[PDB]
C-alpha cells in the first residue's frame, strides 16, 4: 500500500540520476554556453565543409561558434556569422584603461603622431571615445581562416593575430581571409 507509493518514488529518482548523467556528463550541454556574446561576420572564397555550430579559435582556445554559411550571389562568395563571447574576447570594466594606456603607449607615440595629419587633440580625444565601448581583443590586422585539426577532424575557424592599432568594433567584416586546402588545391599547388 505505502510500498506502491514509495517504490514508484524510487523509480523516478533513478530516472532522475540517469537523465542528469546524460545531459551533463555525456552530451555537450554544460560545455556550450555563450557568455554574453555578440555577433561578427566575414566573407570567404572557399568553405569546404565548415559545418554549423563549429568552433572558432584565437590561439587554440574555443571562443566562438558558427551560425550561418550562405552565398553572396552578387560576388558568389561565402558569408559566415560567428558569435564570439563578451568576457574572453573583450576588455571588461577595469580593463578599459588597459587599452587607453596602450593607445597612449604605442599608438599615440610622438614619433607616430608626427607621421600623419597635424593636430594636438584630434586623435588624442578620439582614443578616449572610440576605444571605451564596442571593442574586442581582436586587432584589425587579424585575418580569419578555415583550418582543421589532425587529418580527419571537422573544419574550424582560426584567427591569426598580429600588429593592429585599431580594434574591430562590433558586427564588422574581418579584412583578409584564406580558404581551405584539399587534394584539388594542394597537388595543383605543390608543383
Amino acid at each position: 500500500s505505502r510500498t506502491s507509493e514509495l517504490a514508484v518514488g524510487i523509480f523516478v529518482i533513478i530516472f532522475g540520476i540517469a537523465l542528469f548523467f546524460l545531459a551533463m556528463k555525456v552530451s555537450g550541454l554544460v560545455g556550450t554556453n555563450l557568455s554574453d556574446g555578440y555577433t561578427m561576420k566575414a566573407q570567404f572564397d572557399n568553405v569546404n565543409g565548415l559545418k554549423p555550430r563549429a568552433k572558432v579559435t584565437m590561439s587554440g582556445v574555443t571562443i566562438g561558434r558558427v551560425d550561418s554559411i550562405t552565398l553572396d550571389p552578387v560576388t558568389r562568395l561565402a558569408t559566415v556569422t560567428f558569435d564570439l563571447d563578451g568576457k574572453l574576447t573583450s576588455f571588461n570594466a577595469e580593463q578599459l584603461k588597459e587599452v587607453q594606456k596602450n593607445a597612449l603607449d604605442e599608438l599615440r607615440y610622438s614619433s607616430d603622431y608626427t607621421q600623419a595629419t597635424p593636430a594636438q587633440q584630434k586623435t588624442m580625444e578620439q582614443q578616449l571615445i572610440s576605444n571605451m565601448n564596442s571593442i574586442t581583443s581582436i586587432d584589425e590586422d587579424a585575418y580569419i581562416m578555415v583550418a582543421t585539426n589532425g587529418l580527419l577532424g571537422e573544419k574550424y575557424l582560426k584567427i591569426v593575430p598580429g600588429g593592429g592599432l585599431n580594434y574591430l568594433k562590433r558586427g564588422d567584416t574581418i579584412s583578409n581571409t584564406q580558404g581551405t586546402m584539399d587534394l584539388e588545391d594542394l597537388i595543383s599547388k605543390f608543383i
Partner: protein
C-alpha cells in the same frame, strides 16, 4: 484453391482487427478522467515499470560490455580509439537503447498485461464489472495504457546510462585506454537535442505500439484457458515487428 481462399480469409480478419483496435484507442484517450483515476495510475506504474527495472538494468550492462569489447577490436587496427567513447555512446543513444529496450519491454511487461487483462475476460470479471455500471475500459484498461506510455521512456534512459557506464568499465579500466580522451571524445561529437532527445521521441512512438497492442490482445481474446496463451504470443510477435518497422521510418527522418 482452398489454401488461397483460407489465406485471403486470414488477412481480412487481421485487417478488421486493426479497425477495432483503432476505435478502442479513440475511446480511451478522448475522455476526461473519472474520480480516483490517479490513484490507480500510480499503482499500475509499480506493476509495469518497477518490476521491469531489474531486467533492463542487468541486460543494459551486458550490451555495454559487448559494445566496448567489439568497438575496441575494430578501432585498434586503424589505431584511432579516441573515438571509442563516441561510437559506444552513439550506438546506444540513437539506435540500440530505443530498440533493444523495446524488445525486452514487449516480453516482460508487454505480454504480462495481455495475461492480466486476458484472465479477467475468461473468468467473467469484465462482464460482472459492467452490470454494476462501471465501464471496464475506463476502470481497468485505461490506467494500464497510461502506465505504459510513461514507463518505457523512463526505462530507455536507464538502459542508455547503464550501457555507457558499462562500456566505460571494459574500455578504460580493463583494456587500458585513456580516461580523459574517453569522456572528451563524447562532448565533441554527441549533442543533446539531436541525439538524446531524438532517442526519447523514438521510444515514445515505441511505447505507444507495445502497449496499445498488448492491451487490445488481452481485451479482445476468446475466453478459453488455451485461447489466452495463444494471444500472448500474438502480442510479442506483433510488437517486435512494429518496433523494427517504425525503426527504419524514424531513422530515415531523424538522421537522413
Amino acid at each position: 484453391m482452398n489454401t488461397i481462399a483460407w489465406l485471403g480469409r486470414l488477412v481480412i480478419e487481421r485487417i478488421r482487427g486493426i479497425g477495432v483496435a483503432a476505435l478502442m484507442l479513440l475511446q480511451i484517450i478522448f475522455s476526461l478522467p473519472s474520480a480516483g483515476g490517479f490513484g490507480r495510475f500510480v499503482y499500475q506504474m509499480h506493476r509495469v515499470g518497477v518490476m521491469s527495472l531489474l531486467i533492463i538494468t542487468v541486460s543494459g550492462l551486458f550490451i555495454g560490455l559487448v559494445l566496448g569489447l567489439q568497438g575496441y577490436s575494430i578501432l585498434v587496427n586503424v589505431g584511432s580509439e579516441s573515438m571509442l567513447g563516441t561510437m559506444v555512446s552513439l550506438t546506444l543513444l540513437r539506435e540500440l537503447a530505443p530498440v533493444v529496450a523495446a524488445l525486452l519491454f514487449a516480453g516482460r511487461a508487454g505480454s504480462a498485461l495481455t495475461a492480466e487483462i486476458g484472465s479477467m475476460k475468461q473468468s467473467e470479471q469484465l462482464a460482472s464489472m459492467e452490470m454494476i455500471g462501471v465501464d471496464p475500459l475506463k476502470q481497468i484498461v485505461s490506467p494500464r495504457l497510461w502506465a505504459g506510455i510513461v514507463s518505457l521512456p523512463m526505462l530507455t534512459v536507464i538502459f542508455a546510462a547503464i550501457g555507457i557506464v558499462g562500456g566505460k568499465l571494459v574500455g578504460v579500466d580493463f583494456l587500458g585506454v585513456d580516461e580523459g580522451s574517453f569522456w572528451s571524445g563524447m562532448q565533441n561529437n554527441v549533442q543533446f537535442g539531436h541525439d538524446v532527445v531524438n532517442g526519447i521521441i523514438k521510444s515514445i512512438v515505441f511505447a505507444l505500439l507495445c502497449t496499445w497492442i498488448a492491451v487490445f490482445q488481452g481485451y479482445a481474446c476468446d475466453p478459453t484457458p488455451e485461447g489466452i496463451a495463444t494471444a500472448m504470443t500474438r502480442t510479442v510477435v506483433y510488437s517486435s515487428l512494429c518496433v523494427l518497422g517504425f525503426d527504419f521510418v524514424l531513422t530515415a527522418v531523424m538522421f537522413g
